[PDB]
């Protein structure tokens, strides 16, 4: 199925805690979890090729990738990483990340589409999991 769309957040669980495991200091966390930082996600999918733009009121970030091909992005806390996405199933992709420099928590993300059209974004840092759920506007 098709991940394309303009997605708006309807659920967010455990995001502040993910930030703590990543070592984001408290001043930045308050900003990051504020409504001004609420994410909107735009996806354009063509087969295995994806464009994903994630924007807030003050920030915008775009990734471009094809499933199975390595690309560069940033960890949630903004460290450059090499990422690789694979299909876990027909409706679910999983991305492993490796830091370009230094050491840190093991991080990953997954995106999956439910039959009822919800987009579930899961982010992990070691033993902590954050889940965000979106629907199409
Ligand atoms: C991933 C979530 C981020 C970056 C921010 C979300 C913040 C909020 N806030 C402050 C809020 C208040 C009411 C309902 C929903 C939210 C949301 C989780 C968007």
From Swiss-Prot:
Induction annotation: By retinoic acid.
UniProt keyword annotations, A-Z: Cytoplasm, Endoplasmic reticulum, Isopeptide bond, Nucleus, Retinol-binding, Transport, Ubl conjugation, Vitamin A
Record-level Gene Ontology MF annotations: cyclin binding; fatty acid binding; retinal binding; retinoic acid binding; retinoid binding; retinol binding
Any single GO CC term annotated in Swiss-Prot or TrEMBL for this entry: cytosol
Any one GO BP annotation for this protein: fatty acid transport
Record remark on domains: Forms a beta-barrel structure that accommodates hydrophobic ligands in its interior.
Complex formation: Interacts with RXR and RARA. Interacts with importin alpha.
Protein name stated in the entry: Cellular retinoic acid-binding protein 2
Lineage: Eukaryota, Metazoa, Chordata, Craniata, Vertebrata
Gene giving rise to this polypeptide: CRABP2
């Amino acid at each position: 199925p098709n991940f394309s769309g303009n997605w708006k957040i309807i659920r967010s669980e455990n995001f502040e805690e993910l930030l703590k495991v990543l070592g984001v200091n408290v001043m930045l966390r308050k900003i990051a979890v504020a409504a001004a930082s609420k994410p909107a996600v735009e996806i354009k999918q063509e087969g295995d090729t994806f464009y994903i733009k994630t924007s807030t009121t003050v920030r915008t970030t775009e990734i471009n990738f094809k499933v199975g091909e390595e690309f560069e992005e940033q960890t949630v806390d903004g460290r450059p990483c090499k990422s690789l996405v694979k299909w876990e199933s027909e409706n679910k992709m999983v991305c492993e990340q490796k830091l370009l420099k230094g050491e840190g928590p093991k991080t990953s993300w997954t995106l999956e589409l439910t039959n009822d059209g919800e987009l579930i974004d899961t982010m992990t840092a070691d033993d902590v999991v954050c889940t965000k759920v979106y629907v199409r506007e």
